Amino acid sequence: EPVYPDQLRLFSLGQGVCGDKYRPVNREEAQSVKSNIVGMMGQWQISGLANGWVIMGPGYNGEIKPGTASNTWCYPTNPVTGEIPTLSALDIPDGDEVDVQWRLVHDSANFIKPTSYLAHYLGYAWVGGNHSQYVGEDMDVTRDGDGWVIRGNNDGGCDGYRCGDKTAIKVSNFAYNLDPDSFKHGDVTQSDRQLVKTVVGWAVNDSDTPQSGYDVTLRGDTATNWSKTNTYGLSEKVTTKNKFKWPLVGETELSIEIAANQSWASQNGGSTTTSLSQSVRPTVPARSKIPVKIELYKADISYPYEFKADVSYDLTLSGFLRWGGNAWYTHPDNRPNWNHTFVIGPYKDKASSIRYQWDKRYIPGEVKWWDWNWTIQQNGLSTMQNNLARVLRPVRAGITGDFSAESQFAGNIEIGAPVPLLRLEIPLDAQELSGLGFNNVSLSVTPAA
Amino acid sequence: EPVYPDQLRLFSLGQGVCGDKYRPVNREEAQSVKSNIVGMMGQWQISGLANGWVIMGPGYNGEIKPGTASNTWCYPTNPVTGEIPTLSALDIPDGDEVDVQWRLVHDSANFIKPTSYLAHYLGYAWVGGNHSQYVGEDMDVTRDGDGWVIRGNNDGGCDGYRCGDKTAIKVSNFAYNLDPDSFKHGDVTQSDRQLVKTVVGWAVNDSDTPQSGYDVTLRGDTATNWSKTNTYGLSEKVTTKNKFKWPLVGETELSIEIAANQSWASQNGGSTTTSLSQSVRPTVPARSKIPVKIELYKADISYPYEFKADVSYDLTLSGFLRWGGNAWYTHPDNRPNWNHTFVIGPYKDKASSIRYQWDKRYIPGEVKWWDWNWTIQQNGLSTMQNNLARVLRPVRAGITGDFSAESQFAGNIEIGAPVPLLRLEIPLDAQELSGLGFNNVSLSVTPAA
């Protein structure tokens, strides 16, 4: 009877008052899911729990102590049970795309067997070859254009009504979305950082009155020459939902961003240029000057990287539905030749979401596709969870290569101790800085605004 | 004027209804933070925005479309401005404790400079050695028991009231909490699952009445032998707040768990027996028997692992407060020798929490220590934000080693096509099975419920 974070619900109805049909989560429970509750709160928020206890936002390390609050963390009085576990991803080794599909589609234990049992549990008939008495066994795996078809082998002769019409399991419409959070790198091959130059000088306040309201700003541009290899071909078909900054490693800093909805192998490197945008606002006492320093750098890195790409695809089951032993909601007995497709990956619509239908299996208005509750009474809550936990298991391919970058950048503008005497007195040799890789470098003393 | 995700508050009062002193977040605002709002929502949760618009939970891919809901995502009508930015973590490689601490503390850019400036901005005097005009330079970092002290060098003479009384930045009381989520693993060295045996038999329905409503269940014991190495000593002082199961890699199922509050290096292996409890619900027709199968495996895995430990510590600033330029709330001008600790990491209390004091700087009765608003007027909001961001930047140390496991388990109980002719006639050789490492194995038949 564990509490399912995702069923929790926050209410604002007074001390210890839950919305209708829910009840308060007590500390004991709050403790077991502490991580998930704090994660849904504001930094300094205080929400109430049962029997004079409260739980605090991450700002408070999620402390749970005695207290009162007008809002309450509530949980269903009649909790929906048997959620589908989320197993750890099945890592597929990088390779060419076919290398990846092959390894997935021919995996008996992790794919063929479990998707087959699904079709079987749903109601499809003859999901297995004539050479086995068990389901998901003796199955030919045939290529069919882009997708793959998995059917029971007919070789020889079978015996049973329409036993000759084996169920097909079509796998198609593959996509590989790169997960920027799975970044990882090896031994930092090349690494080093040099101080190519320090720009020094003064800012002066020639008056008898001190000065504040003036921003000292330094602008200019520099560059970063980078490159990344892509050991395999799958790279050509992997994309990111949204752009991102390449992770920092070591000390050296970089300015690199990968585009979204664009191939990973098409963004193999290049030379981009960066701005310089510091703007300090120092106070200089009348008849005085502060020393101002600016350090210029040049560093570079080399290291093997590795990101993970989530593999998603369409699962299509087609054959005919059993007699007095079916899971469609109408429960046909005319052996209709059904054709359904679930999407194994991000939500698309209710019809294709095993997870959706399964989690709303109790709101009658929602059960418009598969009667998940029926499969549960037929095989038992466990067999169903486990079966689905395998089919919905996260499949991931690894994308690897080499990374190397060279960049130049400025440190911060630093001001020192004022000294007895706003205008600047710091020499810039536009020519020289340029030679070192710093362009249109300039320093502006301008009124604050 | 960005919306601060962590200032959001959910109310359950009806379409568009926010609690007092709060207003409904609109589309555009919801857009710019979509990632965070959807990350604070239950999987299938649907919450209202302004003007009949609704934002959906993560299970729905966080979709924003026209809709109505009972609860509303709200925002303050007077938010606290200028939140301290949260930078990207600073990853430090594995190594012995001192080495890890050294790499953090001896870091000028990420540590010395930022913490020095903090002390400078707060009013501490002489935060730098007399070899540099700039704050945070010519700093001597010395070992002070278990901590470290960063104090300005004193060689030679100095010039300034009590300038020989350099402020000291003392870093101490380090803690390291391993993040079970940070888990990563290299190339799977050893890996493979041998089918050591496959028990086969039949389940017979001695009646004319098609029996069902009873489930067959296998049960017994078998061991899992695991070992792991810890490359460095940082391990001896790291823990986990709560226990956890070791992550599943490949197919080889395991059952192993790390205890909480037990040094990582003290849990390097052992042999832990694991049970086995499969079960199926065979619906067998009249006068019939079905073939049942149970494959028993043996698999082993080996791979280098790596987690991440969050580094926390106390930061104490001590020196005297500058005259006419100070930030303690009472603003002393008697150059008192001050002493103060900040806890850099999880929350501990108000006095030692920069984030708290910063977010509550506009509540008069909350300003009992440092006057943050002062520093803003003294250096500018942007300068203060960037400094505190560097100072509060998350620091994670990496934990590494090798892991290897060898276990045994049963696959699911599979059943086949019922055949013309509940008791089980599946033979179990206790001795054979015990000789293969499978003990107390048995098959029971009981009422499905």
Side-chain angles (χ1 to χ4, degrees), chain B residues 288-306:
Chain B
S288 297
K289 54 185 183 56
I290 49 171
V292 311
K293 192 182 67 163
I294 304 177
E295 316 197 335
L296 299 166
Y297 308 100
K298 148 180 180 180
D300 36 53
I301 188 116
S302 286
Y303 60 69
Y305 74 81
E306 168 177 31

PDB file of all heavy atoms in Angstrom, chain B residues 288-306:
ATOM      1  N   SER B 288      -8.748 -31.335 -19.010  1.00  0.00           N
ATOM      2  CA  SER B 288      -7.572 -30.915 -19.747  1.00  0.00           C
ATOM      3  C   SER B 288      -6.401 -30.622 -18.835  1.00  0.00           C
ATOM      4  O   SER B 288      -6.531 -30.542 -17.606  1.00  0.00           O
ATOM      5  CB  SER B 288      -7.879 -29.677 -20.598  1.00  0.00           C
ATOM      6  OG  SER B 288      -8.857 -29.950 -21.587  1.00  0.00           O
ATOM      7  N   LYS B 289      -5.251 -30.459 -19.474  1.00  0.00           N
ATOM      8  CA  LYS B 289      -4.005 -30.177 -18.797  1.00  0.00           C
ATOM      9  C   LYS B 289      -3.252 -29.195 -19.670  1.00  0.00           C
ATOM     10  O   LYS B 289      -3.432 -29.169 -20.889  1.00  0.00           O
ATOM     11  CB  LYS B 289      -3.207 -31.469 -18.639  1.00  0.00           C
ATOM     12  CG  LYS B 289      -2.979 -32.212 -19.939  1.00  0.00           C
ATOM     13  CD  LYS B 289      -2.291 -33.526 -19.673  1.00  0.00           C
ATOM     14  CE  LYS B 289      -1.984 -34.248 -20.966  1.00  0.00           C
ATOM     15  NZ  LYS B 289      -1.170 -33.404 -21.878  1.00  0.00           N
ATOM     16  N   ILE B 290      -2.415 -28.383 -19.044  1.00  0.00           N
ATOM     17  CA  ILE B 290      -1.647 -27.400 -19.783  1.00  0.00           C
ATOM     18  C   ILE B 290      -0.181 -27.540 -19.440  1.00  0.00           C
ATOM     19  O   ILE B 290       0.167 -27.900 -18.314  1.00  0.00           O
ATOM     20  CB  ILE B 290      -2.098 -25.974 -19.430  1.00  0.00           C
ATOM     21  CG1 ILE B 290      -2.152 -25.823 -17.910  1.00  0.00           C
ATOM     22  CG2 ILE B 290      -3.474 -25.686 -20.023  1.00  0.00           C
ATOM     23  CD1 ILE B 290      -2.366 -24.409 -17.467  1.00  0.00           C
ATOM     24  N   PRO B 291       0.701 -27.296 -20.418  1.00  0.00           N
ATOM     25  CA  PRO B 291       2.135 -27.406 -20.137  1.00  0.00           C
ATOM     26  C   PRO B 291       2.597 -26.139 -19.412  1.00  0.00           C
ATOM     27  O   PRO B 291       2.247 -25.032 -19.809  1.00  0.00           O
ATOM     28  CB  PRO B 291       2.752 -27.521 -21.536  1.00  0.00           C
ATOM     29  CG  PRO B 291       1.838 -26.662 -22.365  1.00  0.00           C
ATOM     30  CD  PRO B 291       0.461 -27.085 -21.859  1.00  0.00           C
ATOM     31  N   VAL B 292       3.351 -26.291 -18.333  1.00  0.00           N
ATOM     32  CA  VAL B 292       3.857 -25.116 -17.631  1.00  0.00           C
ATOM     33  C   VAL B 292       5.376 -25.204 -17.672  1.00  0.00           C
ATOM     34  O   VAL B 292       5.950 -26.285 -17.568  1.00  0.00           O
ATOM     35  CB  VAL B 292       3.336 -25.023 -16.174  1.00  0.00           C
ATOM     36  CG1 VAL B 292       1.837 -25.209 -16.169  1.00  0.00           C
ATOM     37  CG2 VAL B 292       4.006 -26.049 -15.291  1.00  0.00           C
ATOM     38  N   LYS B 293       6.019 -24.057 -17.831  1.00  0.00           N
ATOM     39  CA  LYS B 293       7.464 -23.999 -17.964  1.00  0.00           C
ATOM     40  C   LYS B 293       8.057 -22.903 -17.081  1.00  0.00           C
ATOM     41  O   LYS B 293       7.472 -21.831 -16.930  1.00  0.00           O
ATOM     42  CB  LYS B 293       7.776 -23.724 -19.438  1.00  0.00           C
ATOM     43  CG  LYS B 293       9.190 -23.900 -19.884  1.00  0.00           C
ATOM     44  CD  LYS B 293       9.305 -23.527 -21.358  1.00  0.00           C
ATOM     45  CE  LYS B 293       9.064 -22.037 -21.549  1.00  0.00           C
ATOM     46  NZ  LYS B 293       9.545 -21.561 -22.875  1.00  0.00           N
ATOM     47  N   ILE B 294       9.212 -23.186 -16.491  1.00  0.00           N
ATOM     48  CA  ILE B 294       9.906 -22.221 -15.643  1.00  0.00           C
ATOM     49  C   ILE B 294      11.387 -22.341 -15.882  1.00  0.00           C
ATOM     50  O   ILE B 294      11.991 -23.296 -15.437  1.00  0.00           O
ATOM     51  CB  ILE B 294       9.715 -22.497 -14.163  1.00  0.00           C
ATOM     52  CG1 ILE B 294       8.235 -22.532 -13.812  1.00  0.00           C
ATOM     53  CG2 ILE B 294      10.443 -21.430 -13.362  1.00  0.00           C
ATOM     54  CD1 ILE B 294       7.972 -22.868 -12.365  1.00  0.00           C
ATOM     55  N   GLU B 295      11.978 -21.381 -16.577  1.00  0.00           N
ATOM     56  CA  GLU B 295      13.411 -21.440 -16.827  1.00  0.00           C
ATOM     57  C   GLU B 295      14.120 -20.815 -15.632  1.00  0.00           C
ATOM     58  O   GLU B 295      13.632 -19.842 -15.064  1.00  0.00           O
ATOM     59  CB  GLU B 295      13.741 -20.696 -18.109  1.00  0.00           C
ATOM     60  CG  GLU B 295      12.751 -21.028 -19.208  1.00  0.00           C
ATOM     61  CD  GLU B 295      13.245 -20.661 -20.581  1.00  0.00           C
ATOM     62  OE1 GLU B 295      14.091 -19.752 -20.675  1.00  0.00           O
ATOM     63  OE2 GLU B 295      12.779 -21.276 -21.565  1.00  0.00           O
ATOM     64  N   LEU B 296      15.249 -21.394 -15.236  1.00  0.00           N
ATOM     65  CA  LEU B 296      16.032 -20.908 -14.103  1.00  0.00           C
ATOM     66  C   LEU B 296      17.363 -20.400 -14.663  1.00  0.00           C
ATOM     67  O   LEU B 296      18.066 -21.118 -15.359  1.00  0.00           O
ATOM     68  CB  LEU B 296      16.285 -22.045 -13.112  1.00  0.00           C
ATOM     69  CG  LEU B 296      15.061 -22.696 -12.468  1.00  0.00           C
ATOM     70  CD1 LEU B 296      15.449 -24.008 -11.792  1.00  0.00           C
ATOM     71  CD2 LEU B 296      14.468 -21.733 -11.460  1.00  0.00           C
ATOM     72  N   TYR B 297      17.716 -19.163 -14.361  1.00  0.00           N
ATOM     73  CA  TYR B 297      18.952 -18.620 -14.898  1.00  0.00           C
ATOM     74  C   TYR B 297      20.059 -18.412 -13.884  1.00  0.00           C
ATOM     75  O   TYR B 297      19.932 -18.640 -12.678  1.00  0.00           O
ATOM     76  CB  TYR B 297      18.664 -17.310 -15.604  1.00  0.00           C
ATOM     77  CG  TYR B 297      17.574 -17.395 -16.626  1.00  0.00           C
ATOM     78  CD1 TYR B 297      16.289 -16.970 -16.318  1.00  0.00           C
ATOM     79  CD2 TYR B 297      17.822 -17.899 -17.906  1.00  0.00           C
ATOM     80  CE1 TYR B 297      15.274 -17.037 -17.249  1.00  0.00           C
ATOM     81  CE2 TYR B 297      16.806 -17.968 -18.857  1.00  0.00           C
ATOM     82  CZ  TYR B 297      15.537 -17.529 -18.512  1.00  0.00           C
ATOM     83  OH  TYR B 297      14.534 -17.598 -19.439  1.00  0.00           O
ATOM     84  N   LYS B 298      21.150 -17.945 -14.456  1.00  0.00           N
ATOM     85  CA  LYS B 298      22.378 -17.630 -13.792  1.00  0.00           C
ATOM     86  C   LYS B 298      23.039 -16.595 -14.681  1.00  0.00           C
ATOM     87  O   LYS B 298      23.276 -16.845 -15.866  1.00  0.00           O
ATOM     88  CB  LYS B 298      23.158 -18.907 -13.475  1.00  0.00           C
ATOM     89  CG  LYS B 298      24.668 -18.739 -13.513  1.00  0.00           C
ATOM     90  CD  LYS B 298      25.378 -20.043 -13.189  1.00  0.00           C
ATOM     91  CE  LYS B 298      26.888 -19.874 -13.226  1.00  0.00           C
ATOM     92  NZ  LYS B 298      27.597 -21.144 -12.911  1.00  0.00           N
ATOM     93  N   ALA B 299      23.333 -15.456 -14.107  1.00  0.00           N
ATOM     94  CA  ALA B 299      23.960 -14.400 -14.890  1.00  0.00           C
ATOM     95  C   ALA B 299      24.939 -13.636 -14.028  1.00  0.00           C
ATOM     96  O   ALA B 299      24.862 -13.646 -12.805  1.00  0.00           O
ATOM     97  CB  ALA B 299      22.929 -13.456 -15.471  1.00  0.00           C
ATOM     98  N   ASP B 300      25.868 -12.963 -14.680  1.00  0.00           N
ATOM     99  CA  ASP B 300      26.805 -12.144 -13.953  1.00  0.00           C
ATOM    100  C   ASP B 300      27.083 -10.917 -14.797  1.00  0.00           C
ATOM    101  O   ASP B 300      26.936 -10.942 -16.021  1.00  0.00           O
ATOM    102  CB  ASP B 300      28.091 -12.903 -13.603  1.00  0.00           C
ATOM    103  CG  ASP B 300      28.507 -13.861 -14.665  1.00  0.00           C
ATOM    104  OD1 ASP B 300      28.617 -13.433 -15.832  1.00  0.00           O
ATOM    105  OD2 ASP B 300      28.731 -15.042 -14.325  1.00  0.00           O
ATOM    106  N   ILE B 301      27.438  -9.836 -14.110  1.00  0.00           N
ATOM    107  CA  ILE B 301      27.726  -8.557 -14.732  1.00  0.00           C
ATOM    108  C   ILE B 301      28.911  -7.909 -14.021  1.00  0.00           C
ATOM    109  O   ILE B 301      29.148  -8.151 -12.834  1.00  0.00           O
ATOM    110  CB  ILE B 301      26.502  -7.630 -14.619  1.00  0.00           C
ATOM    111  CG1 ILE B 301      26.721  -6.364 -15.440  1.00  0.00           C
ATOM    112  CG2 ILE B 301      26.246  -7.291 -13.158  1.00  0.00           C
ATOM    113  CD1 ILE B 301      25.759  -6.224 -16.582  1.00  0.00           C
ATOM    114  N   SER B 302      29.657  -7.100 -14.768  1.00  0.00           N
ATOM    115  CA  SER B 302      30.812  -6.374 -14.252  1.00  0.00           C
ATOM    116  C   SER B 302      30.940  -5.091 -15.050  1.00  0.00           C
ATOM    117  O   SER B 302      30.824  -5.102 -16.276  1.00  0.00           O
ATOM    118  CB  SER B 302      32.087  -7.194 -14.397  1.00  0.00           C
ATOM    119  OG  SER B 302      32.105  -8.227 -13.436  1.00  0.00           O
ATOM    120  N   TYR B 303      31.172  -3.986 -14.352  1.00  0.00           N
ATOM    121  CA  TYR B 303      31.302  -2.701 -15.009  1.00  0.00           C
ATOM    122  C   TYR B 303      31.770  -1.630 -14.051  1.00  0.00           C
ATOM    123  O   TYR B 303      31.489  -1.684 -12.854  1.00  0.00           O
ATOM    124  CB  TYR B 303      29.959  -2.292 -15.608  1.00  0.00           C
ATOM    125  CG  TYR B 303      28.840  -2.148 -14.597  1.00  0.00           C
ATOM    126  CD1 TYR B 303      28.847  -1.112 -13.656  1.00  0.00           C
ATOM    127  CD2 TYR B 303      27.770  -3.047 -14.580  1.00  0.00           C
ATOM    128  CE1 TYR B 303      27.817  -0.977 -12.719  1.00  0.00           C
ATOM    129  CE2 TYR B 303      26.736  -2.917 -13.648  1.00  0.00           C
ATOM    130  CZ  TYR B 303      26.769  -1.883 -12.721  1.00  0.00           C
ATOM    131  OH  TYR B 303      25.771  -1.779 -11.787  1.00  0.00           O
ATOM    132  N   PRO B 304      32.528  -0.653 -14.561  1.00  0.00           N
ATOM    133  CA  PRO B 304      33.001   0.423 -13.700  1.00  0.00           C
ATOM    134  C   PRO B 304      31.780   1.305 -13.450  1.00  0.00           C
ATOM    135  O   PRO B 304      30.949   1.514 -14.347  1.00  0.00           O
ATOM    136  CB  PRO B 304      34.057   1.101 -14.557  1.00  0.00           C
ATOM    137  CG  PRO B 304      33.501   0.951 -15.922  1.00  0.00           C
ATOM    138  CD  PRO B 304      33.064  -0.495 -15.922  1.00  0.00           C
ATOM    139  N   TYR B 305      31.658   1.795 -12.226  1.00  0.00           N
ATOM    140  CA  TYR B 305      30.534   2.621 -11.868  1.00  0.00           C
ATOM    141  C   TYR B 305      31.017   3.992 -11.463  1.00  0.00           C
ATOM    142  O   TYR B 305      32.220   4.223 -11.309  1.00  0.00           O
ATOM    143  CB  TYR B 305      29.781   1.976 -10.707  1.00  0.00           C
ATOM    144  CG  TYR B 305      30.483   2.099  -9.372  1.00  0.00           C
ATOM    145  CD1 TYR B 305      30.390   3.268  -8.624  1.00  0.00           C
ATOM    146  CD2 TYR B 305      31.242   1.046  -8.852  1.00  0.00           C
ATOM    147  CE1 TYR B 305      31.029   3.387  -7.395  1.00  0.00           C
ATOM    148  CE2 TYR B 305      31.891   1.158  -7.615  1.00  0.00           C
ATOM    149  CZ  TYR B 305      31.775   2.333  -6.901  1.00  0.00           C
ATOM    150  OH  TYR B 305      32.396   2.478  -5.694  1.00  0.00           O
ATOM    151  N   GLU B 306      30.061   4.901 -11.301  1.00  0.00           N
ATOM    152  CA  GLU B 306      30.331   6.261 -10.869  1.00  0.00           C
ATOM    153  C   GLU B 306      29.036   6.933 -10.429  1.00  0.00           C
ATOM    154  O   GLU B 306      28.015   6.858 -11.113  1.00  0.00           O
ATOM    155  CB  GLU B 306      30.983   7.080 -11.986  1.00  0.00           C
ATOM    156  CG  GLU B 306      31.011   8.573 -11.697  1.00  0.00           C
ATOM    157  CD  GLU B 306      31.708   9.367 -12.772  1.00  0.00           C
ATOM    158  OE1 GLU B 306      31.650   8.954 -13.955  1.00  0.00           O
ATOM    159  OE2 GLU B 306      32.303  10.414 -12.432  1.00  0.00           O
TER     160      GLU B 306
END
